[PDB]
Design a protein around this ligand. Structure first.
Ligand SMILES: NC(=O)c1ccc[n+]([C@@H]2O[C@H](COP(=O)([O-])OP(=O)(O)OC[C@H]3O[C@@H](n4cnc5c(N)ncnc54)[C@H](OP(=O)(O)O)[C@@H]3O)[C@@H](O)[C@H]2O)c1
Ligand SMILES: O=C(O)COc1cc(Cl)ccc1C(=O)NCc1ccc(Br)cc1
Length: 316
């Protein structure tokens, strides 16, 4: 299987990338350096992760060392919810560019479909704990994203955590100039996303699977939640293939024509996670993994559920 997938902007995107949410700032520079050394060419970033400066130090050092050329890297970031406004989008993108020490992004995503009140706080709340919305809509935010392409700041634009109706809304936007290249969504054997993936793929939108290992380090994890990495059924498939459970969990989305972005700051795991291009899951393995769906989401947040554009009320 090829290492890159063709996007609807004509560029190629590496199907394996390194995730950076929760990567501590004192560890992420080395994580990214190691990743690039062992073959990663795609890094998934976001302003809200608060570590783009440190990710950027690594990228810049590897460019300076001439380990890789800029054209060989595929750097992704995301517009946070408090920047949905027309007058804030460019500056948000530019802050990310400055922190990452880049002149352009390969892909810039609307991080969540919901706009929040601008200000210093990433999750502005009212006194009762509800997020404070902005009156911005996804269509006007999309127009602002299109401007970034036309100014040369980003090569591609896309969306993240958009449900099927929201993707459709963008595709049906009056005067749409650029289709979204990517929808980045949670996807793993406990949240298999068959409906949304089929819709997006049918429209030529590439899907990126986040939290492919079930995000065991998510800060809201409870001791009782299901655990992909410990699931004996998945362990059995891994054992049959002489691979680790994580390697199976990474190969799974790859064979569905998805991009996948496992996170690690452990050098041995960063390397392990990349060694997924030399084995194949059978069709029976794939269907078996799909059968584990339980509609379980890592990524959801009670404080945001009443926002008009919160994505997880719809079935898909
Ligand atoms: N667009 C969005 O809204 C959104 C939401 C969530 C995530 N994402 C992106 O997707 C990325 C991945 O998702 P995620 O960070 O939620 O979780 P994940 O990649 O599913 O899991 C990361 C966890 O798995 C551990 N791990 C990694 N490789 C392992 C291996 N080979 N064996 C055992 N454990 C391993 C990591 O530990 P160590 O790091 O300690 O090694 C870390 O605790 C994020 O970092 C972010 O870039 C985007
Ligand atoms: O959104 C992500 O990429 C990962 O999740 C988070 C990352 C940070 Cl740095 C801070 C908060 C979250 C989080 O709570 N995500 C869940 C969520 C769900 C719906 C909306 Br709208 C916003 C966040």
């Amino acid at each position: 299987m090829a290492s890159r997938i063709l996007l609807n902007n004509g560029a190629k995107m590496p199907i394996l990338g390194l995730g950076t949410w929760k990567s501590p700032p004192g560890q992420v520079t080395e994580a990214v350096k190691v990743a690039i050394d062992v073959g990663y060419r795609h890094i998934d970033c976001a302003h809200v992760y608060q570590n783009e400066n440190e990710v950027g130090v690594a990228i810049q050092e590897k460019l300076r060392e001439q380990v890789v050329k800029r054209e060989e890297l595929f750097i992704v970031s995301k517009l946070w919810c408090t920047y949905h406004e027309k007058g804030l989008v460019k500056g948000a993108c530019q802050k990310t560019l400055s922190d990452l020490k880049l002149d352009y992004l390969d892909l810039y995503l609307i991080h969540w479909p919901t706009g929040f009140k601008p200000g210093k706080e990433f999750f502005p709340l009212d006194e009762s704990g509800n997020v404070v919305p902005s009156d911005t809509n996804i269509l006007d935010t999309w127009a602002a994203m299109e401007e970034l392409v036309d100014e040369g700041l980003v090569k591609a634009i896309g969306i993240s955590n958009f449900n099927h109706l929201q993707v459709e809304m963008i595709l049906n936007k009056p005067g749409l100039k650029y289709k979204p290249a990517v929808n980045q969504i949670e996807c793993h054997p406990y949240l298999t996303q068959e409906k949304l993936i089929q819709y997006c793929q049918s429209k030529g939108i590439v899907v990126t699977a986040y939290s492919p290992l079930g995000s065991p380090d998510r800060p809201w994890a409870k001791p009782e939640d299901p655990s992909l990495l410990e699931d004996p059924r998945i362990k059995a498939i891994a054992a049959k293939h002489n691979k680790t459970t994580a390697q199976v969990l990474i190969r799974f989305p790859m064979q569905r024509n998805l991009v996948v972005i496992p996170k690690s700051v452990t050098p041995e795991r960063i390397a392990e996670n990349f060694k997924v291009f030399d084995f194949e899951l059978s069709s029976q393995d794939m269907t078996t993994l799909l059968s584990y769906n339980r509609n379980w989401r890592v990524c959801a947040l009670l404080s945001c559920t009443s926002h008009k554009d919160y994505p997880f009320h719809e079935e898909f």
